[PDB]
Design a protein around this motif. Structure first.
Motif, PDB file in Angstrom:
ATOM      1  N   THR A   1      -8.733   0.968  -4.704  1.00  0.00           N
ATOM      2  CA  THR A   1      -8.654   0.092  -3.540  1.00  0.00           C
ATOM      3  C   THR A   1      -9.609   0.568  -2.472  1.00  0.00           C
ATOM      4  N   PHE A   2      -9.616   1.862  -2.188  1.00  0.00           N
ATOM      5  CA  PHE A   2     -10.563   2.436  -1.266  1.00  0.00           C
ATOM      6  C   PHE A   2     -11.994   2.091  -1.687  1.00  0.00           C
ATOM      7  N   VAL A   3     -12.406   2.370  -2.928  1.00  0.00           N
ATOM      8  CA  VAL A   3     -13.792   2.104  -3.345  1.00  0.00           C
ATOM      9  C   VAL A   3     -14.138   0.619  -3.286  1.00  0.00           C
TER      10      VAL A   3
ATOM     11  N   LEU B   1       0.825  -1.208   0.000  1.00  0.00           N
ATOM     12  CA  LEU B   1       0.000   0.000   0.000  1.00  0.00           C
ATOM     13  C   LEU B   1       0.863   1.263   0.000  1.00  0.00           C
ATOM     14  N   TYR B   2       1.933   1.267   0.792  1.00  0.00           N
ATOM     15  CA  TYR B   2       2.778   2.438   1.006  1.00  0.00           C
ATOM     16  C   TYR B   2       3.440   2.993  -0.266  1.00  0.00           C
TER      17      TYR B   2
ATOM     18  N   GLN C   1       1.838   2.373  -3.506  1.00  0.00           N
ATOM     19  CA  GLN C   1       0.848   2.271  -4.581  1.00  0.00           C
ATOM     20  C   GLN C   1       0.376   3.623  -5.123  1.00  0.00           C
ATOM     21  N   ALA C   2       0.074   3.647  -6.425  1.00  0.00           N
ATOM     22  CA  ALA C   2      -0.325   4.850  -7.143  1.00  0.00           C
ATOM     23  C   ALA C   2      -1.629   5.410  -6.581  1.00  0.00           C
ATOM     24  N   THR C   3      -1.826   6.702  -6.767  1.00  0.00           N
ATOM     25  CA  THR C   3      -2.983   7.412  -6.246  1.00  0.00           C
ATOM     26  C   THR C   3      -4.285   6.807  -6.727  1.00  0.00           C
TER      27      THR C   3
ATOM     28  N   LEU D   1      -4.668   3.270  -5.086  1.00  0.00           N
ATOM     29  CA  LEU D   1      -5.119   3.535  -3.732  1.00  0.00           C
ATOM     30  C   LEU D   1      -6.599   3.909  -3.726  1.00  0.00           C
ATOM     31  N   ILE D   2      -7.036   4.810  -4.598  1.00  0.00           N
ATOM     32  CA  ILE D   2      -8.436   5.253  -4.660  1.00  0.00           C
ATOM     33  C   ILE D   2      -9.370   4.120  -5.100  1.00  0.00           C
TER      34      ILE D   2
END
Lengths: 88, 178, 89
Positions: free
Chosen positions: C74-76, C63-64, C66-68, C71-72
């Motif tokens: 992944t969040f959704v 995660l640390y 990973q591309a924006t 990450l986004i």
């Protein structure tokens, strides 16, 4: 996901967040079109991975997409006129 | 702005020496108190600037006529306390908005021109002219959008007047904001 | 690191696990794995690689960097519960 936010319009002051709702477009991927009454919250509710991704994205403090994402998730109801902290 | 007016280079220097003192205090907290994450001098000041800019914006959006009045107005009878519906937005005319455009320009200039040099200690972090343009446009654009929606319900100014305003706004955005 | 950039406490950039500290750790972990393997005298490489403990550790690490957008996304995909009833509306 859609994030729906109600705000009080306030010239001279600041436009206060009244509340926020999330709609997952996975649902609409089946539904095609949906009428729905989204209940509004004070802040969006999160797991460890949302909070981990968020603390990771907040370190990307020059990426404009990350800035606006972090800002957008970190939007909460400016508490007043009806209350501060929600439930998840 | 109010405490160290650009018109006083001496207070701009006291201002400069003040931020040199504030770096000296941040450095004391860091070095003598041995604090690990004291308040960063650039962010401390950026808050103060945003503060001073927002106080400026509130004051200009509420007092547009008194300010544009005294600072530029193309008729001396219009320098005074013109009605609040003309120091904030009018439904009758677009002139408050042409006036607000010039106020915005003037401030961004003073910030770009007097304060960005006075407050060079964090040059990478603290372009006072850019922080000015962003803060002021943001606050403006909200107010302007609602105004144009309000005019649309009443149509008291001619089509032409909004077209003229469009060229001014088009220019303004395409100058400072874009 | 809740405190220093999830949370409100400090206007610091927190400093991520930087690519170099992501490495170093990924190598420290391969060494710990080799240690725990002890050339077959300890735990099988297979147990260690399939270790959910290791896989979890690798995930957090992944995660640390990973591309924006990733990450986004992944969040959704992960925040699935942000779509099943607000509490105190």
């Amino acid at each position: 996901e859609l994030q729906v936010c109600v705000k009080d319009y306030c010239f001279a002051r600041e436009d206060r967040t009244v509340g926020l709702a999330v709609l997952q477009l996975r649902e609409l991927a089946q539904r095609g079109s949906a009428a729905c009454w989204l209940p509004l919250g004070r802040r969006i509710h999160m797991d460890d991975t949302g909070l981990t991704v968020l603390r990771i994205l907040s370190q990307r403090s020059n990426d404009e997409v990350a800035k606006e994402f972090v800002k957008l998730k970190s939007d909460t109801r400016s508490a007043e006129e009806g209350g501060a902290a929600p439930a998840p | 702005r109010n405490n160290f007016p650009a018109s006083s280079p001496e207070r701009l220097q006291d201002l400069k020496s003040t931020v040199d003192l504030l770096t000296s205090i941040t450095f004391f907290r860091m070095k003598v108190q041995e604090l690990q994450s004291p308040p960063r001098a650039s962010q401390v000041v950026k808050d103060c600037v945003k503060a001073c800019l927002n106080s400026t914006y509130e004051y200009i959006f509420n007092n547009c006529h008194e300010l544009y009045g005294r600072e530029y107005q193309t008729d001396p009878a219009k320098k005074g306390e013109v009605p609040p519906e003309e120091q904030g937005p009018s439904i009758k005319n677009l002139d408050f908005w042409s006036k607000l455009i010039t106020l915005i320009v003037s401030i961004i200039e003073e910030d770009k021109n007097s304060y960005t040099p006075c407050l060079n200690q964090f040059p990478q972090e603290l372009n006072v002219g850019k922080i000015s343009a962003e803060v002021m446009w943001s606050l403006f654009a909200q107010d302007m959008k609602y105004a144009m929606e309000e005019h649309d319900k009443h149509r008291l100014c001619k089509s032409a007047d909004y077209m003229n305003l469009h060229f001014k706004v088009k220019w303004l955005y395409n100058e400072y904001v874009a | 690191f809740l405190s220093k950039l999830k949370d409100h406490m400090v206007r610091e950039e927190a400093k991520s696990l930087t690519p170099k500290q992501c490495a170093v750790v990924e190598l420290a972990l391969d060494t710990i794995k080799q240690y725990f393997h002890a050339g077959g005298v300890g735990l099988k490489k297979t147990f260690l690689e399939k270790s959910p403990d290791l896989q979890s550790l690798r995930y957090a690490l992944s995660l640390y960097t990973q591309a924006t957008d990733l990450l986004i996304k992944t969040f959704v995909q992960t925040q699935s519960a942000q779509g099943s009833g607000v509490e105190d509306p």
